[PDB]
Amino acid sequence: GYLNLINAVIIPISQSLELMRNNVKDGTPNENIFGAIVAGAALGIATAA
């Protein structure tokens, strides 16, 4: 019962964090900094933090 209770609050945080990793992509157009790069469409609305 404890496992069934905590699995409702373990899974969506994991899904949200892997979606956060899916929004970023290690790419480099031309003489870039060879990192960062997020898709504007895949993030929606966000702040600086």
Ligand X SMILES: *[C@@H]1O[C@H](CO[C@@H]2O[C@@H](C)[C@@H](O)[C@@H](O)[C@@H]2O)[C@@H](O[C@@H]2O[C@H](CO)[C@@H](O[C@@H]3O[C@H](CO)[C@@H](O)[C@H](O)[C@@H]3O)[C@H](O)[C@H]2NC(C)=O)[C@H](O)[C@H]1NC(C)=O
Shortest distance in whole angstroms from residue 19 CB to ligand X: 5
Residue 18 touches ligand X, criterion: CB under 6 A: yes
Exactly one of 6, 11, 17, 22 binds ligand X (CB under 6 A); which one?
Answer: 22
Phi and psi at residue 20, to the nearest 5°: -65, -40
Q: How far apart are CA 6 and CA 3, in angstroms?
A: 5
Say which amino acid occupies 21. Answer: R
Shortest distance in whole angstroms from residue 5 CB to ligand X: 24
The site for ligand X (CB under 6 A) is made up of 18-19, 22
